[PDB]
């Protein structure tokens, strides 16, 4: 049985960030830190945190600046700094909390995003990263005349609605998508510049930053991912530092491979690679 508490702290700018706490009721194994992607909350991890604690996992899950019930103008961001700051801090709360026990971070699209520029930053402060359609990549995305223009307006106009997204693509599962197109809480509306800025930043830099992480690294990616090509994550893999790196395919998934029909083995797959190595 994993129960959740939820907290909070203050973070950049003094917005004040909301996570949950998912503790197993056996002896705890070691700490996972995660990362949720854009227009979304910690929320729809609640699956994931409990699949974590029965393999005795605590799961540090916080809801991003302008995301679920942290404050902040919704999908508000200046900086990528932003992001990788909150979550370090939240990082630091679990070293606290279980002092000794190793730390996962998992990140999920822009989370798997936000993960990567945190951990190229502090390759030391964790011990295993689990990257879920990481965000690595987004140039692929916009021509390089568009990504000219991302970043600027980034800067400018951070909160200007600049890309459609198809959340059809999150996932195979009609419910799924249904329950996120009545998500409260979900961002129900078009990438901003300050986020597509900060991704574009993350993707143009990934390779020449990769080398830097050195830790185990586990990706997982559906093959049929129309939102973040799975040609991203195979270039990661290929750009890290890592000697224990994986790439973990799924024929016929959608983006969202979490909350996919294949999701128990997808998270069999995440228990498994975390079990050899703790
Ligand atoms: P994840 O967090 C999954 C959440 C979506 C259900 O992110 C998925 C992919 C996000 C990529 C967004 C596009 C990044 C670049 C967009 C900027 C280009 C638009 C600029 C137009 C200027 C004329």
Redesign the pocket.
């Known amino acids: 049985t994993t129960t959740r508490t939820e907290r909070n702290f203050a973070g950049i700018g003094d917005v004040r960030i909301v996570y949950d706490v998912w503790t197993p009721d056996t002896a705890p194994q070691a700490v996972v830190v995660l990362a ?5 909350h910690a929320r729809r991890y609640d699956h994931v945190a409990q699949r974590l604690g029965a393999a005795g996992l605590v799961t540090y899950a916080l809801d991003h600046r302008g995301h679920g019930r942290s404050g902040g103008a919704r999908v508000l961001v200046r900086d990528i700094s932003e992001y990788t700051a909150d979550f370090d801090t939240l990082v630091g709360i679990a070293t606290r909390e279980y002092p000794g026990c190793k730390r996962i971070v998992l990140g ?6 936000i993960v990567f520029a945190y951990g190229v930053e502090r390759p030391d402060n964790y011990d295993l990263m689990v990257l879920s ?1 990481p ?1 690595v990549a ?2 692929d ?2 021509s390089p ?3 000219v ?2 970043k600027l ?2 800067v400018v106009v951070p909160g200007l609605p ?2 459609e ?3 059809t ?2 996932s195979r599962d009609p419910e799924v998508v249904q329950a ?1 197109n009545t998500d409260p809480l979900v961002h129900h509306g078009r ?1 901003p ?1 300050g ?3 900060a ?2 930043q993350v ?1 143009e830099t990934m390779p020449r930053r990769a080398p830097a992480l050195t830790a185990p690294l586990l990706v997982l990616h559906g093959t049929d991912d129309r ?2 090509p799975i040609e991203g994550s195979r270039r990661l893999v290929e750009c890290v530092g890592s000697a224990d790196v994986q790439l973990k395919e799924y024929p016929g998934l959608y ?2 491979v979490f909350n996919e029909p294949e999701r128990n083995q997808v998270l069999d797959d995440v228990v498994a690679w975390l079990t050899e190595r703790l």
């Open positions: 949720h992607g854009l227009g979304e999920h699209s822009m989370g798997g995003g359609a965000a987004a140039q995305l916009v005349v568009v990504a223009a991302a307006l980034g600049v890309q997204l198809d959340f693509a999150i996120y990438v510049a986020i597509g800025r991704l574009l993707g939102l973040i983006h969202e």
